[PDB]
């Protein structure tokens, strides 16, 4: 694998209270939605580097949300913080009441990232929708959609919805990664060639250590959007369960009535799963096609 | 891994050492001749058939290591224990590692001391010093002037007997400490007089109302001074004992006085230990390179009872949580019939308490009689209650001389329960991947992120001595005052902290936080290098572990040409606009250039040499104009936009690159130290010593401190110039380090000290505490700021008077003792501050006169025939107060010599 070790930059900001550092801590430290009750208060700034399928490494900044810390962001050392920013994530509570101060901070943050980043991008993320009934969830998410599309006028934003007790979190950060990835077309072409000459239902390729949905190809378009989210959540739950057994996963097989899915290592940090559109085949096809795939991806 | 023992017939001690798999005894060795005269006299030639070759797994369960004359942070102690995992030892070996050295001592297995033996990974080593920093607080009361049994004053017992014994043992074990000897006491009913108001205090009791006026006095004797040949302090303490009752009674306020209150009824004891902690919290301010251990000893004639407020006792428990340094000894004798260190509470059954943090020891006198009584007598004329103090049994307590002559450093490994749940509801993990780089920039990112040096948690420092009136008893300090407010906070309510700092390759450091105890776990620079360094920096503060011809060097060359610049200060025609002849045929002659080799510098040269060349051949001081004119063709630096560099008198270190990294926030407890460069002239420095008798203003450099071939540790530290001019005034260099071993930096400082003195002038480390009050970020609670008045007796008074004051100062310049305006680095530059050249003396310019203080950082090294011999400083005091209060006609003759121009 050609190791072009770049260094990307991503900030995570918003108001204190709900879900600022909790989501980062469950997506890069193998926690659960129950054990994230113990993180508590952060401080002004804390950051991290995370490596990610090899070459790309994220400077992930986590910024606090008290009054003095946001004021000491805006009317202070701002030029150091908002410089060379690539990806911004801005967290929205649902249950919080002071919407005026939230959008005031949002306006100031948009103007500051405009005057310190021409070609960055902002993803705003309304989380913690686990407390509201589903019809009102639709209404509140559409109102946040339209209101944030208005107030994010001179530069665009992408607004997603999520909670911690479900899998839309994994979809949203899959979207963040797939935007943040360097290369697309060669991996798409190898994906498409593999899937159209070994005739699978659908093929899926992932990072190993955190399992975010990198790429996918299908020919049975009857699962709407929630297949990727669900399978990622449940096998990372299984990896968390096997974590307490001092053992790695690296390989599994399942077949069913009209169903044949397989998971294995591909490369140094990549998982593959596949369902193969022919359920009555033993592991000889998985053998010859992990051969057929590792001849090509270990030329990549 | 083979072990070889070699006695002879009936040697009652033995000897043994290591090699790697010796079987056939072809090869022997000589490495040490000393061990013959260290153990036993014989001459063993090649094979006398006595050399036993045996594995013999015999361990040495506790080994002691003593230090001398150095400064070793506890990470370096961790490095010595990491290098001392699997070796052998014997009594009085000199163990070395990387310029660090210790002497082995008193090595025990479980009952008995062994001559030699083996150390493998599970025996424990304990570090002790004979070069510590030690305070002696003598508590005075009315029991000093009271007799006891055997016939003595308790003062005379204490000082004469105990201090004579302690100083004889300090001579015998050949130690060298830095002491204070501070007398302290209280008086009652000293309410008020003419402007003595913020000195008093007022004591009270809640449950039964009782409120009185009182006042605390401290009289210091020698403050920060090492010297051999003691017992002169014993004579001075006798003088102060006789002078003491008038010295304490008839001062600042005069109501009816009651002196020196009883220890078993009142006392300023707990406040005295808390003020010693108020000294020791700021150990990182001005760092001696010649002391390691910390020690505070309180000598009392008390019984062991103290009537103490609740808040101060809980606060000093929480402050000895950090750095345990306190030792109490009683020269009263008469070990009472109960648990002897005890506190009756004084809160705003009589509520007892017993401390288990303190180290008490009695001093019995030397005589032999029948039945030593344990009682006094004086004839008047006329829910729980869970600690009582009486059912605790207590036979005898010694003196514990070994914890008073060689102080023990704080341990390394302690066992305690894990970080489960419940109370400490906060954990935070930071996994910090590390990118190796070959360009110093990698530790500080993790450092300022993951802790901000206890950026999470608070330092419980609630005692602030804000006021101190002083008294004009003599030229030591003499602060006599009130403690000021005590702004106590409770501990962190309903949550402690713990942290998980990961290296994303394979490494974890699990920090707990009630006292900083760690658990390190494994699974350009290497990974383990950065991991070890980070564990050392968590180790430095609170560090428990759970377990189970130009030589073109970038300072030397410029320092040497700044030595060349005094002795050179103190071709064809010009006016050709071609400029090719002179500026291209400089290399035709013998013009010395930096062009043979150095990094980032093909064809380089120094401005001062070139301008001295152009004054040696062309006109005087118009060379910078033509130098700018040729700079418009041939440059020096990277992105110039300047004049001819700096034309004259401006320091630049190396690292040619600085234009086109995390800084040091001052919360992080930087270890800093200000060395100093003082232009000097010996021609007056000798006779006043002898029988004769009357462009910015700071610059940062991040340098690598190594002249070796190590390839184990990358080692950097940050210099700040204050000077970019160095006209003929002072010069100073600050060293900020949050980094590598201090002893290597000490030999770097001493290396360019040897380059300073030989071929040049003085470099002296200077206390960068100016005339600062207590409760400042610099300073002590024990500084006088001595005053010297200018009795004159003869439009814009102050400016002309300031210039006349400079004239008197530099007149002491011309006759004995030169001056320099040490332009320090605080913005708007409040007070004018002079350092004297070649001496121990600070002055500032604020009555009419101007004030004085005494430098305490020379300490008999960094010493030449220019400076030195503290009698010099006292002579300059005597001469300066004679010249200042208008003796014979000196100021008046100075007036005439000024007016006759
Ligand atoms: N049940 C539930 N709890 C949530 C949800 N989102 C956040 N929380 C709770 O909110 C708490 C706060 O975590 P978080 O907001 O990340 O902390 P922080 O804001 O970074 N600390 P600071 O205020 O110093 O910046 C977590 O303990 C978590 O249990 C959610 O969707 N469901």
Contact status, residue B849 vs residue B790, Cβ threshold 8 Å: yes
Contact status, residue B154 vs residue B221, Cβ threshold 8 Å: no
Query: Searching chain B, which residue's CA lies closest to the CA of residue A37?
Result: B425
CA separation for the pair A265, B34 (Å, rounded): 64
Q: Is B700 helix (H, G, I), strand (E, B) or coil?
A: strand
How does DSSP classify residue B410?
P
Please report where in the chains the tokens 């000196």 appear, as a residue. Answer: B890
Contacts of A57 in chain B (CB under 8 A): 433, 435
Tokens of residue A71, six digits: 């004021």
CA separation for the pair B780, B282 (Å, rounded): 9
CA-based torsion, A43, A44, A49, A50: positive or negative:
positive
Helix axis angle for B890-899 and B871-884, nearest 10°, is: 70
CA separation for the pair A183, A206 (Å, rounded): 15
Instruction: Give chain A's end-to-end CA distance (angstroms, integer).
Output: 5
Contact status, residue A28 vs residue A50, Cβ threshold 8 Å: yes
Contact status, residue B694 vs residue B815, Cβ threshold 8 Å: yes
Strand pairing partners for A270?
A: A207
| Number of Cβ atoms within 10 Å of the Cβ of B719 | 17
∠ CA B719-B724-B730, rounded to 5°: 85
Please answer yes or no on whether A49 and B433 come within 8 Å at the CB atom: yes
Q: Which run of H or of E encompasses B655?
A: none
Please answer yes or no on whether A46 and B430 come within 8 Å at the CB atom: yes
Pocket of ligand 1 (CB under 6 A): A 16-22, 36-37, 39, 41-42, 64-65, 128, 130, 163-164
| Number of Cβ atoms within 10 Å of the Cβ of B330 | 25
Q: Is B121 exposed, middle or buried (0-12, 13-18, 19+ CB in 10 A)?
A: exposed
Ligand 1 atom with the shortest distance to the CA of A129: 31
Strands (E), B758-815: 762-765, 786-788
Contact status, residue B181 vs residue B136, Cβ threshold 8 Å: yes
Residue A130 assigned to a binding site:
yes
Residue A36 assigned to a binding site:
yes
- Facing A46 at nearest CB: one of B421, B434, B449: B449
Contact status, residue B653 vs residue B717, Cβ threshold 8 Å: no
CA separation for the pair B206, A146 (Å, rounded): 66
Q: How far, CA to CA in Å, does B63 sit from each of B122, B195, B388?
A: 11, 59, 39
Cα dihedral B403, B404, B406, B412 in deg (nearest 10):
40
CA B271 remoteness from chain centre? 23
Contact status, residue B635 vs residue B603, Cβ threshold 8 Å: no
Q: How far, CA to CA in Å, does B742 sit from each of B99, B122, B202, B715?
A: 10, 28, 46, 10
CB contact set of A144 (below 8 Å; sequence gap of 6+):
A92, A126, A159, A161
Could you tell me whether strands B116-120 and B112-113 are parallel, antiparallel, or unpaired per DSSP bridges?
unpaired
Q: Is B30 helix (H, G, I), strand (E, B) or coil?
A: coil
CA separation for the pair B501, B512 (Å, rounded): 11
Domains and CATH numbers, chain A: 1-184 (3.40.50.300), 185-300 (3.30.450.190)
Resolution of this entry in Å? 4.0
Cα dihedral B268, B269, B274, B280 in deg (nearest 10):
120
Q: Which run of H or of E encompasses A141?
A: helix A134-151
Contact status, residue B276 vs residue B296, Cβ threshold 8 Å: yes
CA separation for the pair A79, B428 (Å, rounded): 28
CA separation for the pair B279, B716 (Å, rounded): 29
CA separation for the pair B552, B560 (Å, rounded): 10
Tokens of residue B595, six digits: 């062009």
Tokens of residue B844, six digits: 């500032």
Could you tell me whether strands B133-139 and B178-188 are parallel, antiparallel, or unpaired per DSSP bridges?
parallel
Q: Does B456 touch chain A (CB under 8 A)?
A: yes
| Number of Cβ atoms within 10 Å of the Cβ of B656 | 15
Contact status, residue B17 vs residue B132, Cβ threshold 8 Å: no
Tokens of residue B377, six digits: 């007598």
Pick the closest to residue B530 from B404, B443, B641, B472 (CA basis). B443
CA separation for the pair B518, B753 (Å, rounded): 39
Q: Does B429 touch chain A (CB under 8 A)?
A: yes
Contact status, residue B362 vs residue B397, Cβ threshold 8 Å: yes
Q: Judged by CB atoms within 8 Å, which residues 51-90 of A form the interface with B?
A: 51, 57
CA separation for the pair B664, A18 (Å, rounded): 32
Q: Does A38 touch chain B (CB under 8 A)?
A: yes
CA separation for the pair A283, A252 (Å, rounded): 11
Q: Which run of H or of E encompasses B116?
A: strand B116-120
Contact status, residue B788 vs residue B884, Cβ threshold 8 Å: yes
CA separation for the pair B362, B691 (Å, rounded): 49
Tokens of residue B95, six digits: 């163990």
Helix axis angle for B269-280 and B310-320, nearest 10°, is: 30
Q: What would the DSSP string read from start to end of B164-232? A: HHHHHHHHHTT---EEEEEEEEEEE-----TT-GGGEEEEEETTTTEEEEEEEEEEEEEEEE--SS--H
CB contact set of B222 (below 8 Å; sequence gap of 6+):
B179, B180, B181, B233, B476
Q: Look at ligand 1, atom 27, and give the residue with the nearest C-alpha.
A: A37
Q: Is B453 helix (H, G, I), strand (E, B) or coil?
A: coil
Q: Does B86 touch chain A (CB under 8 A)?
A: no
Could you tell me whether strands A8-14 and A87-92 are parallel, antiparallel, or unpaired per DSSP bridges?
parallel
Q: Does B432 touch chain A (CB under 8 A)?
A: yes
Three-state secondary structure readout of B38-73: HCCCCCCCCCCCCCEECCCCCECCEEEEEECCCCCC
Could you tell me whether strands B342-345 and B305-308 are parallel, antiparallel, or unpaired per DSSP bridges?
parallel
Instruction: Give chain B's end-to-end CA distance (angstroms, integer).
Output: 86
CB contact set of B803 (below 8 Å; sequence gap of 6+):
none
Q: Where do the H-state alpha helices sit in B568-681?
A: 580-584, 607-617, 623-631
CA separation for the pair B851, B844 (Å, rounded): 6
∠ CA B398-B399-B402, rounded to 5°: 115
Query: Searching chain A, which residue's CA lies closest to the CA of residue B421?
Result: A38
- Tell me the HSE value of B409 on the side-chain side, using a 13 A CA sphere: 30
Please report where in the chains the tokens 């096809």 appear, as a residue. Answer: A285
CA separation for the pair B432, B608 (Å, rounded): 47
Tokens of residue B720, six digits: 């700040």
CA separation for the pair A200, B574 (Å, rounded): 89
Residue A14 assigned to a binding site:
no
| Number of Cβ atoms within 10 Å of the Cβ of B499 | 21
Strands (E), A43-86: 45-52, 56-63
Q: Is A64 exposed, middle or buried (0-12, 13-18, 19+ CB in 10 A)?
A: buried
CA-based torsion, A111, A114, A117, A120: positive or negative:
positive
Cα dihedral A157, A163, A166, A171 in deg (nearest 10):
10
Pick the closest to residue B721 from B713, B733, B731 (CA basis). B733
């Amino acid at each position: 694998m050609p190791n072009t070790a770049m260094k990307k930059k991503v900030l995570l900001m918003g108001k204190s209270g709900s879900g600022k550092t909790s989501m980062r801590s469950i997506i890069f430290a193998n926690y659960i939605a129950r054990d994230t009750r113990r993180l508590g208060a952060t401080i002004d700034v804390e950051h991290s580097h995370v490596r990610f399928l090899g070459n790309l490494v994220l400077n992930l900044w986590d910024c606090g949300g008290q009054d003095t810390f946001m004021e000491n962001y805006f009317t202070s050392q701002r030029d150091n913080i908002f410089r060379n920013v690539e990806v911004l994530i801005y967290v929205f509570d649902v249950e919080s009441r002071e919407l005026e101060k939230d959008m005031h901070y949002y306006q100031s943050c948009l103007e500051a990232i405009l005057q310190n980043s021409p070609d960055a991008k902002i993803f705003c993320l309304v989380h913690k929708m686990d407390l509201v009934q589903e019809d009102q969830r639709d209404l509140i998410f559409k109102e946040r959609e339209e209101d944030l599309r208005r107030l994010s006028r001179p530069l665009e934003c992408a607004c997603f919805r999520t909670s911690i007790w479900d899998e839309t979190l994994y979809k949203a950060w899959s979207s963040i990664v797939y935007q943040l990835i360097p290369n697309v077309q060669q991996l798409e072409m190898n994906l498409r060639n593999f899937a159209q000459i070994i005739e699978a239902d659908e093929v899926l390729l992932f990072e190993r250590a955190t399992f975010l949905v990198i790429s996918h190809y299908q020919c049975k378009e009857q699962r709407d959007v929630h297949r990727f989210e669900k399978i990622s959540n449940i096998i990372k739950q299984f990896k968390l369960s096997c974590s307490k057994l001092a053992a790695s996963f690296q390989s599994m097989e399942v077949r069913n009535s009209n169903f044949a899915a397989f998971i294995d290592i591909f490369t140094s940090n990549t998982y593959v799963m596949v369902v193969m559109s022919d359920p009555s085949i033993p592991s000889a096809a998985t053998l010859i096609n992990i051969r057929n795939a590792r001849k090509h991806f270990e030329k990549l | 891994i083979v072990e070889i023992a070699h006695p002879n017939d009936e040697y009652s001690p033995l000897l043994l050492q290591v090699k790697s798999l010796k079987e056939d005894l072809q090869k022997e060795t000589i490495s040490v001749d000393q061990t013959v005269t260290q153990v036993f006299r014989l001459r063993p030639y090649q094979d006398v058939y006595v050399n036993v070759v045996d594995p013999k797994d015999v361990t040495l369960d506790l080994v002691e290591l003593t230090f001398k004359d150095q400064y070793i942070g506890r990470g370096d102690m961790w490095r010595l224990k990491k290098s001392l995992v699997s070796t052998c030892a014997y009594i009085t070996q000199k163990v070395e590692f990387a310029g660090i050295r210790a002497q082995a001592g008193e090595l025990w297995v479980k009952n008995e001391k062994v001559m030699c033996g083996y150390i493998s990974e599970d025996t424990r080593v304990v570090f002790r010093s004979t070069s510590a920093m030690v305070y002696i607080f003598i508590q005075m009361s009315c029991e000093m002037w009271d007799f006891d049994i055997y016939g003595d004053l308790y003062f005379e017992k204490a000082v004469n007997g105990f201090l004579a014994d302690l100083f004889t043992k300090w001579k015998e074990k050949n130690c060298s400490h830095e002491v204070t000897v501070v007398l302290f006491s209280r008086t009652f009913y000293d309410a008020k007089s003419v402007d003595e108001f913020p000195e008093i205090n007022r004591a009270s009791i809640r449950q039964d109302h009782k409120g009185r006026f009182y006042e605390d006095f401290y009289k210091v004797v020698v403050q920060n001074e090492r010297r051999e040949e003691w017992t002169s302090l014993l004579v001075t303490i006798k003088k102060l004992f006789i002078q003491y009752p008038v010295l304490v009674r008839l001062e600042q306020a005069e109501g009816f006085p009651q002196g020196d209150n009883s220890t078993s009824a009142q006392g300023n004891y707990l406040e005295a230990i808390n003020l010693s902690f108020n000294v020791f919290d700021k150990h990182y301010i001005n760092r001696n390179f010649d002391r390691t251990g910390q020690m505070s000893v309180v000598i009392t004639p008390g019984v062991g009872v103290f009537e103490v407020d609740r808040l101060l006792m809980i606060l000093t428990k929480q402050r000895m949580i950090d750095n345990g340094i306190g030792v109490d000894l009683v020269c009263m004798g008469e070990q009472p019939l109960h648990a002897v260190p005890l506190f009756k509470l004084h809160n705003r059954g009589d509520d007892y308490n017993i401390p288990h943090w303190i180290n008490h020891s009695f001093y019995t006198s030397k005589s032999q009689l029948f039945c030593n009584s344990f009682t006094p007598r004086i004839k008047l004329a006329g829910t729980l209650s869970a600690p009582p103090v009486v059912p605790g049994f207590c036979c005898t307590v010694g003196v514990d001389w070994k914890s008073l002559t060689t102080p023990a450093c704080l341990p390394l490994t302690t066992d305690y329960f894990p970080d489960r749940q419940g109370l400490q509801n906060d954990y935070t993990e930071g996994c910090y991947d590390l990118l190796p780089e070959a360009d110093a920039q990698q530790v500080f990112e993790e450092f300022i992120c993951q802790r901000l040096m206890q950026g999470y948690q608070i330092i419980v420092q609630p005692k602030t001595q804000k006021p101190n009136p002083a008294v004009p008893p003599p030229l030591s300090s003499s602060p006599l005052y009130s403690r000021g407010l005590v702004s106590r906070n409770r501990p962190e309510e309903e949550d402690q902290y713990w942290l998980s700092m990961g290296r994303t390759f394979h490494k974890v450091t699990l920090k707990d936080k009630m006292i900083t105890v760690t658990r390190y776990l494994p699974k350009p620079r290497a990974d383990e290098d950065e991991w070890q360094l980070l564990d050392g920096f968590v180790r430095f503060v609170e560090g428990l572990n759970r377990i189970r011809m130009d030589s073109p060097r970038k300072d030397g060359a410029f320092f040497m040409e700044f030595v060349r610049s005094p002795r050179t200060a103190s071709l064809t025609s010009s006016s050709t606009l071609t400029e090719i002849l002179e500026a291209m045929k400089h290399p035709s002659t013998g013009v010395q250039l930096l062009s043979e080799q150095k990094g980032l510098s093909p064809y380089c040269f120094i401005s001062a040499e070139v301008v001295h060349w152009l004054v040696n051949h062309v006109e005087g001081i118009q060379t910078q104009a033509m130098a700018i004119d040729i700079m418009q063709k041939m440059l020096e630096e990277q992105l110039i936009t300047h004049a001819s560099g700096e034309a004259w008198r401006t320091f630049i270190y190396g690292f040619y690159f600085y234009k086109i990294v995390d800084d040091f926030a001052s919360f992080q407890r930087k270890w800093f130290e200000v060395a100093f460069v003082a232009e000097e002239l010996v021609h007056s420095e000798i006779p006043a010593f002898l029988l004769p008798w009357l462009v910015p203003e700071q610059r940062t450099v991040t340098l690598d401190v190594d002249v070796n071939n190590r390839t184990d540790r990358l080692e950097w530290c940050s210099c700040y110039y204050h000077g970019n001019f160095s006209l003929n005034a002072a010069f100073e260099i600050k060293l900020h380090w949050m980094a590598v071993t201090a002893a290597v930096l000490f030999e770097m400082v001493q290396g360019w000290h040897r380059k300073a003195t030989s071929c040049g002038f003085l470099l002296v480390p200077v206390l960068e505490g100016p005339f600062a009050l207590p409760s400042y970020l610099y300073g002590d609670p024990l500084r006088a700021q001595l005053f010297i008045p200018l009795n004159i007796s003869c439009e814009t008074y102050w400016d002309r008077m300031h210039l006349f004051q400079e004239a008197i100062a530099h007149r002491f310049g011309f006759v004995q003792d030169k001056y320099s305006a040490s332009a320090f680095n605080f913005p708007a530059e409040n007070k004018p501050q002079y350092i004297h050249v070649t001496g121990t003396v600070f002055l500032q310019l604020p009555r009419v006169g101007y004030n004085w203080a005494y430098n305490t950082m020379l300490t008999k090294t960094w010493r030449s025939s220019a400076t030195g011999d503290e009698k010099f400083a006292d002579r300059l005091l005597k001469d300066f107060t004679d010249f200042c209060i208008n003796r014979d006609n000196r100021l008046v003759t100075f007036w005439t010599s000024c007016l006759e121009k």
